[PDB]
Design a protein around this nucleic acid. Structure first.
Lengths: 136, 106, 51, 197, 98, 172
RNA sequence: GGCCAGCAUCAGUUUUGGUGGCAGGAUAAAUCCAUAGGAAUGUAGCUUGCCUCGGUAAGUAUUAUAGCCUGUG
RNA sequence: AGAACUGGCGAUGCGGGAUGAACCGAACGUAGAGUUAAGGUGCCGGAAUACACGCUCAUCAGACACCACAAAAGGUGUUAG
RNA sequence: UUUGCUCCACACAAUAUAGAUGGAUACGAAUAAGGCGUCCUUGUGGCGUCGCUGAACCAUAGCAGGCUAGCAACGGUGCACUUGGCGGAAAGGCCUUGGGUGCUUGCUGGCGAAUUGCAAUGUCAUUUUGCGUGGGGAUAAAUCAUUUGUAUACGACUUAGA
């Protein structure tokens, strides 16, 4: 007989856990937790993204589901080496989170001419969808 | 097309006022979509027009227009200060108002 | 009949203080200093980082 | 942004939602509040029952019929909190109150329309996990509201009808996504993806 | 006279050679090479009040041919120039790139 | 009183004819600016030596920066405070990244848990804890465990709109 | 030639941004690089004892198939 | 009730303390613009349902000087020492 | 009480406004958890995927949007009808059948715009009432007075009388 209990997976605050800065000067760059100061402050390092090593509050960052093996208290040179070895910036770009993020600056960078072209293209696509939907 | 709007909709909140004293010469306008004073900096100097309906036929139309302009920001939530050629009747607290894109700086 | 403030009106800034034109020539406010670099003694560094 | 905004009162705080609505009403936005019987109040049930009893005993001595009226319905209890947040004795404050409609449950046509919530007023987003809260429907019944079972019977019937509507909508949405997925791999699909669409 | 000389072209959207103020104009990012046009003939005294005068009609036809030749180079520009600009629901001009 | 900085201040006890070249006392002062740092320096010499601002001068004031501003340490701090009844001595340990930041949170913690204002707190000593298991407070011991992972089983993310079209989810 | 406005170039007062060149501190401190020493919330290895051919468990071992700290430059 | 020094009210509006002759700010020709004082920025109400560290759950919580009251003594309530 | 009363299509007028100017776009429930897809022994199931805001989605090109020529599709959409069903909490709305007709920017064209002269909301709502054309329908009561006393200071109340 089964003894099923739901797991309810959570993003743990841990050494090696990759963060995403949402408030501050970075505002969208990737960093990794190096050492845990207390329940609300952590030490992060974003050397590939350009984030200086600093003590940040947990309310200014959002944890990502990416995790890589990083020693506790590893310096900037050590963090940057394990970051490229695990290819953190490649796994992040393949996630739907970054593809949803990268989509929204692309729409914000649309010119007035490009906004007209999107209108035309969506009208051609809507013709094919309506034809396919009305025959099934 | 379906929409011919070249303006942004605003709302007349109240006059510039203290707790118990108001100044009708300056009106507070809330522009939709704006929530920061930095975004409100774009709308500085833009022309404001209040469209209302009258009863007596004036010039072949029952619509009279009161013009104004955005002078400065107000607060931290994107509210802007406005001074019109003639002060708003103070019965339009919450009435829709039109902010145009000219004079444009883009 | 009207006071024109210097530091924003250059014509008044040239009426008073005729050296202001010379001040803009060598620019007189971004002058690079001579590169020193003699180092403080050990007793200053030990005192600064003392417990 | 909308002609009429319909707010679902379930899971909200009576005070933090009223202050949000009172500001929207003064700005000229029509507000309709549904399901006022599922509003939440911070503090245990015995706290709020004692507070209402303190309010209940406040009445004019020489004529009880002209004193403070202690309304028992959940819609009017939320209205009383909202009424004191608006200068209702002026012409401007009276016009703001005619832009507001509060109901128990979800009434007709506002049942066929979209309902929204106020993020800064949800009980789950403001209260610490462990704090005790009271339901407005249960509190109203304990002070003299006699329509809790009628609303609960009508609400249960409404959810059955709305579940059948969602099954048709969910099945139609899956058919739409199949045609939109077939719309991919084409020239117009790849050009749209280059422009962020 | 601190104003701008503009053209639709008249064949595309019906805006002839006209004079407008620079403060009532939003400049976009789309660029068309104007280095094939004889604009130097037109001046402030050209637009003198003194129906539509006949001579200015052929000046409109001699200028638009030098633009529609390059309009056809970039795709969908001719249809773009014949469509009116408007603000939709949710559009925020303080972040709209023009 | 603000975002602190660490200063070193040297007084001199201005020379008389009888006694030239005095002893040049030195202290480390936590303050926001140099004006308060010099004021706090004279306040403590008036509690230790027969000297005041009129009888002495400030030889030098230098700002002390952290040697390793980006390495998490454990700080053992001794304080003496004035309460509503009397004077008491405390020892507390704060896990932070610098001496200045650890002092800043202590003033917040002292005011929160004991209602002690800045004027009623004396910083006796801020010392580093070199070794593990020399930390005596349990709320610092928790973060020194091996392979420490902790979740946040609630997510109140802030919103910017008065109305949202979906119910929020606190998954994390 | 009134009255009411628009734009441009100015003056006075002021508000809000972008950006450049320099001067100071321990001639920032760090990071970084080099070197020496050291420790465990002890890495690989070794060894021991349980075990669904391997995963753990405590001893050894100061950089190795992880790293860190301190001093100096 | 009776003195000492000074500042005020009386003779004084204005902004603030919901409200008040004395308190805080600041004293007043008629206007415009800009900046602040004291006090405030959930709504009434103009202004951040700002940020940061903690403390508190009260079957009569608490919420701001003058100010419109509370004590001795107690609590394996909880926090820090 | 001098062809009055009411309803629908429309025409001319006035009156009125707390404020239309792309679209109020419908599961429920949990939050120390769920949505969706799929499989399965249909479960408090397995697996996959998603969130981190609506910054979305649908709609949106033409004289405020003309005149016409085709191509490719058998769709999209508006309107007047029509078929059937559901909805009583304030239903007064929703879904759907059949054809008719108009438009289509899904694609390729041909003409028309100007002089409103450098900006002046540039009129585009529905609200009631009035008044005339003409397409249907309907053919009463109450009060005073008189009377009654289950009522009553007076009004009121309760009754009666072709």
């Amino acid at each position: 007989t089964d003894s099923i209990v739901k797991a309810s997976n959570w993003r743990l605050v841990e050494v090696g856990r990759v963060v995403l800065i949402k408030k501050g000067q970075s505002a969208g760059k990737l960093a990794a937790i190096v050492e845990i100061i207390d329940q609300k402050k952590v030490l992060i390092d974003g050397p590939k993204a350009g984030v200086p090593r600093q003590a940040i509050n947990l309310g200014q960052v959002v944890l990502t589901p990416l995790t890589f093996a990083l020693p506790r208290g590893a310096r900037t040179a050590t963090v940057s080496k394990k970051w490229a070895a695990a290819a953190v910036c490649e796994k992040w770009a393949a996630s739907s989170w970054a593809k949803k993020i990268a989509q929204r600056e692309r729409r914000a960078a649309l010119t007035d001419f490009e906004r007209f072209q999107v209108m035309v293209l969506r009208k051609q696509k809507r013709y094919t969808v309506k034809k396919a939907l009305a025959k099934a | 097309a379906e929409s011919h709007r070249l303006y942004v909709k605003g709302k007349h909140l109240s006059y510039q006022r203290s707790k118990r004293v108001n100044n009708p010469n300056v009106s507070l306008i809330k522009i939709e979509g704006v929530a920061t004073p930095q975004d409100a900096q774009f709308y500085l100097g833009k022309r404001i027009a209040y469209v209302y309906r009258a009863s007596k036929e004036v010039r072949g139309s029952k619509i009279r227009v009161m013009w104004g302009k955005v002078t400065r920001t107000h607060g931290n939530s994107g509210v802007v200060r406005a001074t019109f050629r003639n002060n708003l009747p103070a019965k339009t607290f919450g009435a829709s108002v039109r902010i145009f894109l000219y004079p444009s700086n883009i | 009949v009207l006071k024109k403030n210097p530091l924003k009106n250059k014509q008044v800034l040239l009426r008073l203080n005729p050296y202001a034109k010379v001040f803009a020539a060598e620019k007189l406010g971004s002058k690079k200093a001579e590169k020193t670099g003699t180092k403080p003694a050990a007793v200053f560094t030990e005192t600064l980082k003392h417990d | 942004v909308e002609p009429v905004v319909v707010i679902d009162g379930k899971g909200h705080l009576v005070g933090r939602l009223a202050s949000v609505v009172a500001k929207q009403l003064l700005n000229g936005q029509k507000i309709v509040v549904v399901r006022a019987e599922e509003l939440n109040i911070s503090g245990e049930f015995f706290r709020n029952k004692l507070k209402y009893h303190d309010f209940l005993r406040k009445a004019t001595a020489f004529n009880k019929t002209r004193g403070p009226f202690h309304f028992r319905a959940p819609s009017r209890i939320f209205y009383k909190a909202l009424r004191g947040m608006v200068s209702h004795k002026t012409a401007r404050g009276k016009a703001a109150l005619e832009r507001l409609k509060v109901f128990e449950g979800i009434p007709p046509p506002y049942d066929k329309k979209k309902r929204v919530v106020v993020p800064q007023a949800l009980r789950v987003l403001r209260l610490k996990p462990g704090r005790k809260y009271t339901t407005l429907g249960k509190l109203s019944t304990s002070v003299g509201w006699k329509y809790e079972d009628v609303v609960a019977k009508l609400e249960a019937k409404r959810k059955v009808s709305s579940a059948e509507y969602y099954a048709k909508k969910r099945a139609f949405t899956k058919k739409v996504a199949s045609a939109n997925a077939t719309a991919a791999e084409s020239d117009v699909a790849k050009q749209l993806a280059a422009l962020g669409y | 006279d601190n104003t701008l000389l503009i053209s639709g072209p008249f064949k595309v959207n019906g805006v002839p050679l006209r004079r407008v103020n620079a403060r009532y104009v939003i400049a976009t990012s789309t660029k068309v090479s104007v280095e094939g046009v004889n604009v130097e003939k037109f001046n402030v005294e050209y637009f003198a009040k003194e129906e539509i005068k006949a001579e200015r009609v052929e000046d409109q036809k001699v200028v638009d041919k030098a633009l529609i030749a390059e309009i056809k180079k970039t795709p969908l520009l001719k249809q773009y120039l014949s469509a009116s600009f408007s603000l939709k629901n949710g559009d925020k001009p303080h972040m709209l790139k023009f | 009183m603000a975002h602190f900085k660490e200063y070193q201040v040297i007084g001199r006890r201005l020379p008389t004819e009888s006694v030239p070249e005095p002893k040049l006392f030195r202290m480390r002062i936590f303050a926001s600016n140099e004006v308060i740092a010099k004021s706090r320096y004279w306040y403590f010499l008036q509690k230790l030596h027969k000297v005041k601002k009129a009888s002495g001068e400030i030889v030098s004031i230098n700002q002390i920066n952290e040697a390793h501003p980006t390495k998490v340490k454990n700080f053992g701090v001794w304080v003496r405070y004035d309460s509503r009844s009397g004077t008491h001595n405390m020892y507390k340990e704060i896990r932070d990244v610098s001496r200045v930041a650890a002092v800043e949170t202590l003033y917040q913690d002292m005011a929160a848990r004991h209602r002690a204002r800045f004027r009623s707190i004396h910083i006796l000593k801020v010392a580093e804890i070199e070794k593990t298991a020399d930390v005596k407070r349990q709320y610092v011991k928790q973060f020194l465990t091996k392979d420490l992972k902790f979740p946040l089983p609630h997510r109140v993310q802030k919103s910017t709109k008065t109305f949202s079209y979906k119910r929020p989810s606190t998954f994390y």
